[PDB]
Design a protein around this ligand. Structure first.
Ligand SMILES: [Cl-]
Ligand code: NA
Length: 257
């Protein structure tokens, strides 16, 4: 059994559900940007989902990232961006502006505030339907926003059942071509997936990085080797390189078990 820096860790065989590794696997901690996983999951499960539906980037999404020093996809105010493009913006560069846009689009309500609240409600309902008990969301991008290595792994496993989600999280780079106010096509700066495992770990296929002042360095990981898929989560590691290493050790351990 490997030693990891993270104070929370968990891994299982995605196909069988069998646990492969645990470390305070059911201890509630802050999730940071790993919350984006649930946001993507909820969006992809919407009955009225249209990946090609366009959303206009509101001034509010931009002001929000600045006011909260949040990670962003650099969405330009006035631009028309599709739900698909927003999903890449959410999962690769950890775009909280993309998260805001998606919550605004799929939440139910007459105001942005009402729709954001409704969307967060859907996130909690989603956790409930998964039979989770140690997860609560109070945001769409990450004290009332917490989870555990086990719960987050279950959430990710559920999301991975969607082919679109799988396609997005295994993508290393994506360049969105958005529609300008004048109707022209803008080639945005390329988005790179913040998950270094995609390039450092052979067989890596997901899932999502996360960080925060309270959550520290987190990472939900997945990889396939020899027809076996290991999926897991590390919470509160000490650095970006440390979280990547923690995940690498856990997956290597899980594959060798
Ligand atoms: Cl991060
Ligand atoms: Na992140």
């Amino acid at each position: 059994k490997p030693t990891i820096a993270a104070v929370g860790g968990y891994a299982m065989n995605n196909g069988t559900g069998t646990t492969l590794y645990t470390k305070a696997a059911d201890t509630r901690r802050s999730t940071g940007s790993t919350t984006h996983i649930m946001t993507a999951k909820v969006v992809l499960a919407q009955s009225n989902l249209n990946l090609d539906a366009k959303v206009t980037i509101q001034k509010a999404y931009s002001d929000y990232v600045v006011a909260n020093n949040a990670s962003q996809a650099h969405l330009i105010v006035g631009d028309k961006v599709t739900v698909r493009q927003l999903l890449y913006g959410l999962m690769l560069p950890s775009g909280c502006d993309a998260a805001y846009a998606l919550a605004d689009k799929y939440g139910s309500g007459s105001t942005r505030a009402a729709r954001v609240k409704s969307f967060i409600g859907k996130m909690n309902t989603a956790a409930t339907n998964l039979g989770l008990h140690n997860t609560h969301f109070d945001s769409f991008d990450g004290g009332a926003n917490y989870s555990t290595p086990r719960d987050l792994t279950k959430i990710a496993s559920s999301a991975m059942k969607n082919s679109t989600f799988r396609t997005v999280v295994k993508t290393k780079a994506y360049t969105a071509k958005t529609v300008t106010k004048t109707g022209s096509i803008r080639t945005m700066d390329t988005w790179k997936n913040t998950n270094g495992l995609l390039s450092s770990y052979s067989g890596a296929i997901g899932v999502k990085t996360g960080s925060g002042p309270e959550a520290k360095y987190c990472l939900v990981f997945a990889a396939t080797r020899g027809g076996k898929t290991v999926i897991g989560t590390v919470l509160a590691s000490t650095s970006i390189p440390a979280r990547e290493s923690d995940a690498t050790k856990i997956m290597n351990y899980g594959f060798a078990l």
